[PDB]
Coordinates of C-alpha atoms in Angstrom, one line a residue:
Chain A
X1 CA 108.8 119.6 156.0
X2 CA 110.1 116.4 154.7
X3 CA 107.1 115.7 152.2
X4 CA 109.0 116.4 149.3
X5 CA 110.4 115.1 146.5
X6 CA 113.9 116.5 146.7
X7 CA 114.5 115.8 150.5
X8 CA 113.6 112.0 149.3
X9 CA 116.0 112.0 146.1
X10 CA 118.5 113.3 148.8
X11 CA 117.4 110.2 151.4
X12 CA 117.5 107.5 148.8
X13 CA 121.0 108.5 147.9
X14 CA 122.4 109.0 150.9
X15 CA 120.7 105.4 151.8
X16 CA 121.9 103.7 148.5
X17 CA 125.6 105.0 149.0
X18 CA 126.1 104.2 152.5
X19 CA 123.6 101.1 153.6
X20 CA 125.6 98.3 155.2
X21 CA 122.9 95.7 153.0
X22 CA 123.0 95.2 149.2
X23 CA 120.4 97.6 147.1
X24 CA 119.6 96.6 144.0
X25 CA 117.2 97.9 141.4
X26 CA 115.9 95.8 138.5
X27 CA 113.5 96.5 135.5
X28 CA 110.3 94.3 135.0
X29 CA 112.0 91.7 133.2
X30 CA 114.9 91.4 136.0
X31 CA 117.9 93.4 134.1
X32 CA 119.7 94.6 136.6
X33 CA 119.5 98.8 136.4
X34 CA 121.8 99.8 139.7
X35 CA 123.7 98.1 142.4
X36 CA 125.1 99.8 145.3
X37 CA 128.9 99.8 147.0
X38 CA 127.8 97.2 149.4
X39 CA 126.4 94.3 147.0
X40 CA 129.4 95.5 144.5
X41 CA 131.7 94.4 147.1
X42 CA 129.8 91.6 148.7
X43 CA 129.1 89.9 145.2
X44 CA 132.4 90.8 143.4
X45 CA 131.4 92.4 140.3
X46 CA 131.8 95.9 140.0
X47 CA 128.7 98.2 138.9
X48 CA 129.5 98.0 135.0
X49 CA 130.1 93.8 135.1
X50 CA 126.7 93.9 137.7
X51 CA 124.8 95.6 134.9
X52 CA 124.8 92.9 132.1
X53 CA 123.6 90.6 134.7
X54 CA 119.9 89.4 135.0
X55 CA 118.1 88.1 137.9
X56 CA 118.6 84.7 138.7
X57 CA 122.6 84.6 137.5
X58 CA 124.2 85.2 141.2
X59 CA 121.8 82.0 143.1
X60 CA 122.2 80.1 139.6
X61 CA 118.5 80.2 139.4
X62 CA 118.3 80.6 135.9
X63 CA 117.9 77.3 134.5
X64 CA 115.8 75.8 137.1
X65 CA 112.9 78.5 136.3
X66 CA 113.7 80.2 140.0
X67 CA 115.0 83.2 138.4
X68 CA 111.3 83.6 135.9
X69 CA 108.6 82.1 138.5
X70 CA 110.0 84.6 141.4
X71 CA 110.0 87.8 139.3
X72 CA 106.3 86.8 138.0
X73 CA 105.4 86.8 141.8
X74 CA 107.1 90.1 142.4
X75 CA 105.8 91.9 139.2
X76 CA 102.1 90.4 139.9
X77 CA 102.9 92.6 143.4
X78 CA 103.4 89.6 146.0
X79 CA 106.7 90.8 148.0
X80 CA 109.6 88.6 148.2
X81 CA 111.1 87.3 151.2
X82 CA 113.7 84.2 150.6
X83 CA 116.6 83.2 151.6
X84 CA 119.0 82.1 148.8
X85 CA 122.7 80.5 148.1
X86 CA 124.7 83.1 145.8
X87 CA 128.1 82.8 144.1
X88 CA 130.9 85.6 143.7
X89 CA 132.4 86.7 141.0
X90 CA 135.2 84.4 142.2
X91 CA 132.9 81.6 143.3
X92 CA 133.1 81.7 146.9
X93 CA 129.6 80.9 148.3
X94 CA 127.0 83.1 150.4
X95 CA 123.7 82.9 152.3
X96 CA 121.8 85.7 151.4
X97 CA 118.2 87.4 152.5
X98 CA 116.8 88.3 149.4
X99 CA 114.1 90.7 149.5
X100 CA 112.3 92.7 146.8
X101 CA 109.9 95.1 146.1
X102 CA 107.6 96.6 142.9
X103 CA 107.9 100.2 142.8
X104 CA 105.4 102.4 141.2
X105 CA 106.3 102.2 137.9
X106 CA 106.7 98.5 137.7
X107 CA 110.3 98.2 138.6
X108 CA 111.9 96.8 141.8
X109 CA 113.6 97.4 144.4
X110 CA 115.5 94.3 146.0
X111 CA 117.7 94.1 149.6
X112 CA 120.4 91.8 149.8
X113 CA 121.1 90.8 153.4
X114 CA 123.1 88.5 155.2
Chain B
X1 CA 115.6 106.2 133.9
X2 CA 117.5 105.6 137.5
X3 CA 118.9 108.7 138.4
X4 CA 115.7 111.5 138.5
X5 CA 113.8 112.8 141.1
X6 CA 110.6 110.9 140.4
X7 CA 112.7 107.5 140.8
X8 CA 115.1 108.7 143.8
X9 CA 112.1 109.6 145.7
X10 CA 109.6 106.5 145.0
X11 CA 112.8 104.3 145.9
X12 CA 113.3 106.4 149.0
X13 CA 109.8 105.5 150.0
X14 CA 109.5 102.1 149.2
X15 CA 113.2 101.8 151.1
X16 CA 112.1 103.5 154.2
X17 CA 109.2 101.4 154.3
X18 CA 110.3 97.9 153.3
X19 CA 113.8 98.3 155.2
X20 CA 114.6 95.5 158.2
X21 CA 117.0 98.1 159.7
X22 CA 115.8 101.0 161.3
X23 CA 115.5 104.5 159.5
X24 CA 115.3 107.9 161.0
X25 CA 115.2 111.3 160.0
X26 CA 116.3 114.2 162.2
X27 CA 116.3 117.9 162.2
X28 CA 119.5 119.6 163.2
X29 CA 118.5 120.4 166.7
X30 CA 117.9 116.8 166.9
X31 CA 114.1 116.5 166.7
X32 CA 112.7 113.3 165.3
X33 CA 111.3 114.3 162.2
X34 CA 110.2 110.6 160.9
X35 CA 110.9 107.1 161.7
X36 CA 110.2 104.0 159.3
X37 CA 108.1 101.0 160.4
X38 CA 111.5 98.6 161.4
X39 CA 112.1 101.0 164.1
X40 CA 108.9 101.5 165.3
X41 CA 108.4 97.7 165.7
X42 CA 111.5 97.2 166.9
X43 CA 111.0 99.1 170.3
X44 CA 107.3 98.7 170.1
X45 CA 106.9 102.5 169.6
X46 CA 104.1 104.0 167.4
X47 CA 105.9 106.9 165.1
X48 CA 103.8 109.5 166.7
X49 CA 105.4 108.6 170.2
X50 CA 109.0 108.3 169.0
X51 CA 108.0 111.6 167.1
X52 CA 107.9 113.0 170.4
X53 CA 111.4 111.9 171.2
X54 CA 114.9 114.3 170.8
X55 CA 118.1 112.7 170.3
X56 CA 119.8 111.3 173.0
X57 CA 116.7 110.6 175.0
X58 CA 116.2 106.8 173.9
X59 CA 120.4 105.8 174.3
X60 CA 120.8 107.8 177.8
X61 CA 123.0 110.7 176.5
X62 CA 121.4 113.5 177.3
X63 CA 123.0 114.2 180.7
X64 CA 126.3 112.9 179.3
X65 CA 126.8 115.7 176.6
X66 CA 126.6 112.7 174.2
X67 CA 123.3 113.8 172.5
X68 CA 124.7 117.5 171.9
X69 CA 128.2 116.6 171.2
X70 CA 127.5 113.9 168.6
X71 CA 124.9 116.0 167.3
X72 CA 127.5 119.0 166.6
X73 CA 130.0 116.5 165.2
X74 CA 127.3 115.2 162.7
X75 CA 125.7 119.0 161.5
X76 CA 130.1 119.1 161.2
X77 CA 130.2 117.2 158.4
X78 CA 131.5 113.9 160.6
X79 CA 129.5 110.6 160.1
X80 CA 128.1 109.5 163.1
X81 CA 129.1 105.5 163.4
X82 CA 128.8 103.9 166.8
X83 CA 126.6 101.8 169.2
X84 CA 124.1 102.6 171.9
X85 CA 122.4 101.1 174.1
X86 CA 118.6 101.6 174.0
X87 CA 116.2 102.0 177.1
X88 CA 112.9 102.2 176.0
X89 CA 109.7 103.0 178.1
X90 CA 108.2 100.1 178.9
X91 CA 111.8 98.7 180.1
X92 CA 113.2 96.8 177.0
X93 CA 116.7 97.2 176.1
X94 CA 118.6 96.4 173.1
X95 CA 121.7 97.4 171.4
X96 CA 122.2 99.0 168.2
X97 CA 124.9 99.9 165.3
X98 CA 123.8 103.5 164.3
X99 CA 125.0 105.2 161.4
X100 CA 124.1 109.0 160.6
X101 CA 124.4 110.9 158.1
X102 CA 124.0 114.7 157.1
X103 CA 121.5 115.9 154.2
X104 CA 121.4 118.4 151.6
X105 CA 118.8 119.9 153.3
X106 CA 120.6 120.3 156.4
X107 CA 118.9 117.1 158.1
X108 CA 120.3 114.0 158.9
X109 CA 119.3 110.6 157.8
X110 CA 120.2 107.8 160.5
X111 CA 119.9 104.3 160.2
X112 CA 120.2 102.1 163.2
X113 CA 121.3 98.0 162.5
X114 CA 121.3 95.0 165.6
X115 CA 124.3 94.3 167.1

């Protein structure tokens, strides 16, 4: 059996720790709650500089209302699916797949893939 | 909270499900215990047909010794991370980056990537 919640705690760290893709969890209002090794080292900020971030700092998305209008689509339960221009800590530029997800409780869960 | 059981595991299903690579789970005999919905649409399997599958039989190592010898070195304590080719039964074929992994619980999580 596998329909448990301990195997799945087990499966989602073992995914988190080792996935080749960024992970990301955010609350509802896009704080960003964890990162994994992979976007940490992709992105340039370590976990702790990654955790005073909010959503819409790394595709400077803030200003233009990006950052606000795509979390209302994701908290309203639309899934996203965009491809968007982010900056490293150092300022080198990426394309990323940015996908994201509401989980039960109202946070997300977001992929960051090249 | 981030770190408790009743987060881990929702995450681990909304993961599994909303993943673009391919996630597997395995017993340590190498029965395919469950199989998210990348993989399945990847190969054009249903998960109750690739449920029938054993490791090995998909990548041609079963005559090899690749299935049981990689198997072994995973149960070990030894990451699997390598490509195989795919042969699937209606005559596709594609190649993957698989990466495997051994549970807690003494089965192994695999996640397979295009290459």
């Amino acid at each position: 059996g596998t329909e448990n919640l301990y195997f799945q705690s087990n499966a989602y760290r073992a995914l988190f720790e080792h996935a080749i893709d960024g992970i990301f969890i955010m609350d509802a209002e896009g704080h960003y709650l964890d990162v994994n090794p992979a976007i940490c080292s992709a992105i340039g900020y370590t976990r702790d500089e990654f955790l005073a971030l909010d959503w819409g700092v790394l595709s400077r998305g803030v200003d233009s209302g990006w950052a606000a209008a795509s979390l209302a689509r994701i908290v309203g339960g639309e899934p996203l699916r965009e491809e968007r221009t982010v900056w490293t800590r150092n300022g080198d530029q990426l394309t990323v797949e940015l996908s994201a997800h509401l989980l039960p409780d109202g946070k997300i869960l977001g992929i960051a893939r090249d």
